[PDB]
């Protein structure tokens with residue numbers, strides 16, 4: 176009895192070996208033990224079954240668009256009841272689709288991200304594996320059979336911080352219906368929110384009276400801060416100051432412009448403020 180295996184909707188071939196062909200009538204039966212081919216003639220009105228070869232050595236039939244209901248034993252016997260012989264058992268497989276990946280809720284630095292991965296239909300039951308940066312994560316899985324096909328789900332949960340924002344997680348599904356070594360994969364991009372940062376970088380290390388200084392405020396955060404605020408301790412920004420987004424330009428600096436300058440930004444997880452100490456040296460000061 177030949178073990179024959181097809182992917183759902185694919186093509187299988189079933190062959191009856193006959194030995195010293197008498198010329199008598201060959202009955203081929205399906206898994207319900209209903210006559211499917213009477214000698215060379217199809218006995219059931221199913222256009223997916225086609226006689227392919229009736230030679231002195233074998234009778235071969237082809238099945239197109241294989242369905243789960245086609246599974247079971249197929250038989251070949253002489254109408255004279257020489258023997259009830261099973262000549263094949265058909266098994267129909269179902270490969271997983273690319274898995275569906277979801278997240279429980281918005282992940283926030285300091286908290287957890289919780290992901291699920293689901294394959295709704297596979298046969299045999301797909302195996303689900305989680306990867307991050309080539310390294311496998313340990314998840315938790317469950318599945319069940321719904322008729323002849325299995326639904327399988329897996330979940331993983333881990334702490335995140337801002338370094339994980341934008342990181343890629345892979346869920347990978349495998350089963351025997353896929354060619355050896357191959358996989359069905361789904362990528363998921365982490366979105367981790369975090370409180371902002373602010374840092375000032377100045378266009379010069381040493382500032383002299385007469386200089387034009389540019390301060391640049393580098394900001395991070397998720398969500399992205401919408402607005403940079405520039406300010407100064409104790410008193411107002413110099414009259415010539417030009418605060419345009421992330422840059423503060425201080426032209427024509429004079430001694431009285433010295434002081435502490437700040438840039439600040441915010442998102443829904445908090446504020447960040449950077450401070451810059453501005454020293455303005457007269458032309459004769461010895462600094463370096």
Ligand SMILES: *[C@@H]1O[C@H](CO[C@@H]2O[C@@H](C)[C@@H](O)[C@@H](O)[C@@H]2O)[C@@H](O[C@@H]2O[C@H](CO)[C@@H](O)[C@H](O)[C@H]2NC(C)=O)[C@H](O)[C@H]1NC(C)=O
Nearest residue numbers: 196197198199200201213214215216226228229230231232
């Ligand atoms: C049952 O069928 C076999 C197979 O041949 C069938 O008939 C062929 C002529 C052709 O129409 C094919 O499509 C069929 O599969 C019969 O064996 C054949 O007998 C015929 C006699 O006309 C001759 O064509 C072939 O040489 C034979 N082929 C083989 C492989 O033996 C067989 O006689 C049929 N049996 C009965 C009881 O009717």
